[PDB]
Design a protein around this ligand. Structure first.
Ligand SMILES: [Zn+2]
Ligand SMILES: [Zn+2]
Ligand SMILES: [Zn+2]
Ligand SMILES: [Zn+2]
Ligand SMILES: [Zn+2]
Ligand SMILES: [Zn+2]
Ligand SMILES: [Zn+2]
Ligand SMILES: [Zn+2]
Ligand SMILES: [Zn+2]
Ligand SMILES: [Zn+2]
Ligand SMILES: [Zn+2]
Ligand SMILES: [Zn+2]
Ligand SMILES: [Zn+2]
Ligand SMILES: [Zn+2]
Ligand SMILES: [Zn+2]
Lengths: 248, 247, 245, 249, 249
């Protein structure tokens, strides 16, 4: 339902990636004579820390005003925001960030520090088992970012489970854990609202099929928050059984 | 499905705003020869504290009897109530209020103190990325009012997290937080029922699309209540580890 | 889908109310030459404590056997029960009761003590913003009964919140609250099951639209129970921080 | 969608009941010239403790192998199991049991001790306000079995609420309650899984209408479990405020 | 919607099983002149510890690159992963594992230690009351794996309920339970995510009917996690009422 584009109009030199999805599950580097539409979307992966990249970001007409700033590093909190046709999403993992603006024709994503999550999607597109629409891509990314949180949370619980095997712990160790748990909750909560939202807002580029998935992920990430709230309330308890053993 | 109106019949002089939505995402001030229907609804934003405004509120035929009173400041609790065609909704943020009556043709909203939430919707309509139907507007408003609560709750939890780091706190500080938490819960609960309800009642002016969203918001605001119940149960705890450190 | 009735066949003399819904949102007292069907249902509001009323209740053919007893005061717990075409529902508020039997054609409701909830529905029908089908009525009633509980629960929590601001309380005050909370839970729980159920059972007279609503209400009343369970667990705690005095 | 049957092929002498549903809401004792199909299902209510009954159970061709054993008393836990066309369900109330196998044509249900729940369905069929399909019957039964648990739970909570009004309790009373609560949970939990499942598995003989109901019931029974978990966690607490009133003595 | 196969192309010698589903609820050993499609899928049950089996696993063209490694024992965590047409699922029970790759045409499953769960599905296919599509199979397996967890959790709760009756326990016993509970949670949580997901992702080979079921199972297994979290929080409590009984002697 959108205006088709020329392969040139989105050409950045030092662009980490610049792929055209085949719609069958793979990619090919974007050449000047390719057409870009819903069926074959374009994925630009920028490091907003490079010259040509941050230049292209502030200039190119393919973005609204407001997104430029945010796409350039100005956001902190996870949020989905609607720029009419386009959508500006800010996500976090493990704290590393990732800002992307997307409509049905293309996905442009800007990071500074590498995101293990976006690699998995390249590894899969290079192989041929990757996404096919923008909507799919987005799900695959959020799945990944949540796999990561889900694992990293098992690791903290892992450690907190051994501390509960108690010989007291090394001074200030219990705080470095509490700190991490809290950092996690501070960002994993809002990012869940975003997942949940994207599962409700009907965007052109997302199928009822995709929304069922964002529901998965949100509800999943949701349960992760519950396991964190637990871990935290149990580091508050271990700090009282610690100020105790050292009284008797 | 409703009777179209003349642009004049809703003309208030000191009316803070008086816009006609274009249905594309923007607005234009209401002139006498504009037509008002589902496609191009009218949004009146009154300060019920001005003469012409409170006058127009009690007079104009475009409102049922019952709403006049409430639109005029008589309500406290968040509530959606149905006046047949129209709907009277009372919402709160951060405690500031906002009463509105709306049907498919128009939205009339009355505040006394400014509501940061209704600005965001003008900022966005002036720009062209705003709502398009009454239904959309209502969601965008509720999204905003909930973004605000959500943040302000992160701020309280922020402070309560530092107090849990613990050198005692300043006398009576822990009560000013408990107080705020409780104030929030007192109003953010009923307001969540309203969200949820609006997500169930099938109004003409709201799409299955919009109801999915009111569900979002409701369930979201819902989780905010949970984070508050926590914050509170943990200020009750910190006041016992305080009567202990002062034991 | 039911047999139309004559306006006379449901005529009670001291019947508190006896209205015919217009299907537009209002009412008019029932006269002998009115027709009663799905589109214009009849609402009889009896005080089963009056002669003509309790008489008419035990006699009239318009009710099955079993309901007569219950319509007459024999029930305590909230319950929906199916008498084939008709439905017998027992509801409580604030403990005051209200028994009603309804099919698509008419609603007959019996109370002893006045129910603020059923007034609101008259106030609204007299005004013209009231229900239009039996299905709608039932939702509007349950909404009301739940608005009441919801408020009265904020009042208890209100009080329990001040007691948590603690100078000890007046002896035996904390028990009159615990008592109320528990009275509330004893009846507000089963009545939520009823709401939930009505939101599932497909009655002829209720639209998918109305069931979405009974879901609202039930889920709502549901969360009220949660706030009660809290209030109670916190009066059990306040009695230990009191014996600590 | 199943093969119609002769009225004779399911004739048991001492069979507590042996009814043919009219599909309008009532019954009539099964005679030899009645036809049995979806529209008019047959309900056999056996006491597997009688001769002719347990005989008929092990013999008659109208049951698969596997069910015979279980229909005969071999099962303990609530379960729904699929025997292709048929379905074998084991349910419990108040611990009393009830095993039944059913397809669209007929319901055969075996008990040993009387089940107040299955009476209610006879009282209602004799009167004419009872079920009409097998699917409905099954719902009405599970509604009843849950009404019973729901009430009995209010009774335990009732007593546990008075004990929390505390003068100590009679020695060993708090354990007979904890015991009951726990007994309840051990069986009411699995039985809720069964309800929930029946609300998901699409059997021929159950309408989308009936599944909405098994959902009701399951989610209801669900909340009952929650109220039990509470009751139990609060008898664990009352036994510590009791060892306290007997340490401070 | 997929390319039909010859009966030979999937022939392994020491293959524990190698069945063709009849689509009616049973099986027959795979012969060279059988056709394999959605209607009659092929089920290979391999022990990746045998020569011919692990050989066939690394060679045969009927698997993508990535799955070979994992199908061969490389995975630990429960996960569903999509290889385009196919799907690679890793599941655990009671810790024993089971890796499988499946599309609409065939299911290939690899274990090392026997899985009581996959037997039940053979016992039922040999009898004729088993699955009919790949989708059904997958539900029947997960039902089973969850029945097992559900029971084993009742057993730990069982024991934890007796310890709460309380004469102290044998030193280090309460840790062997905590350990088990924790082991269970570590794997039964992620495995629930997989169930839930399979209930959302629309695969060709799963009906809306089957998804309702994976919902069942996921929500069920869900509730088991809740009962574990409880059991654990109550072994943390019993270790404090134990360091208490051993203070005042
Ligand atoms: Zn293509
Ligand atoms: Zn990552
Ligand atoms: Zn934890
Ligand atoms: Zn227009
Ligand atoms: Zn605001
Ligand atoms: Zn907090
Ligand atoms: Zn009419
Ligand atoms: Zn009331
Ligand atoms: Zn409270
Ligand atoms: Zn017939
Ligand atoms: Zn019973
Ligand atoms: Zn209880
Ligand atoms: Zn075939
Ligand atoms: Zn197993
Ligand atoms: Zn347990």
């Amino acid at each position: 339902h959108m205006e088709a584009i020329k392969g040139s109009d989105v050409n950045v030199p030092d662009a980490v990636f610049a792929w055209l999805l085949d719609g069958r599950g793979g990619v090919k580097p974007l050449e000047d004579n390719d057409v870009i539409d819903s069926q074959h979307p374009c994925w630009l992966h920028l490091n907003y820390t490079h010259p040509d990249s941050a230049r292209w970001l502030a200039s190119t007409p393919l973005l609204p005003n407001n997104v430029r700033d945010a796409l350039a590093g100005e956001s902190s909190r996870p949020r989905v925001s609607r720029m009419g046709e386009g959508t500006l999403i800010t996500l976090r993992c493990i704290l590393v960030a990732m800002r992307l603006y997307m409509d049905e024709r293309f996905i442009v994503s800007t990071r500074q520090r590498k995101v293990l999550a976006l690699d998995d999607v390249v590894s899969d597109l290079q192989e041929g088992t990757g996404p096919v629409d923008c909507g799919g891509w987005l799900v695959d990314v959020c799945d990944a970012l949540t796999d990561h949180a889900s694992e990293f949370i098992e690791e903290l619980h892992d450690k907190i489970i051994d501390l509960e095997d108690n010989q007291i712990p090394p001074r200030g160790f219990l705080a470095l854990l509490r700190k991490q748990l809290i950092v996690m909750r501070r960002y994993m909560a809002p990012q869940r609202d975003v997942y949940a939202r994207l599962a409700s807002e009907r965007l052109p580029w997302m199928s009822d099929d995709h929304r069922r998935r964002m529901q998965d992920i949100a509800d999943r990430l949701g349960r992760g928050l519950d396991e964190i709230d637990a871990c935290i309330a149990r580091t508050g308890i271990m700090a009282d059984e610690i100020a105790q053993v050292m009284q008797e």
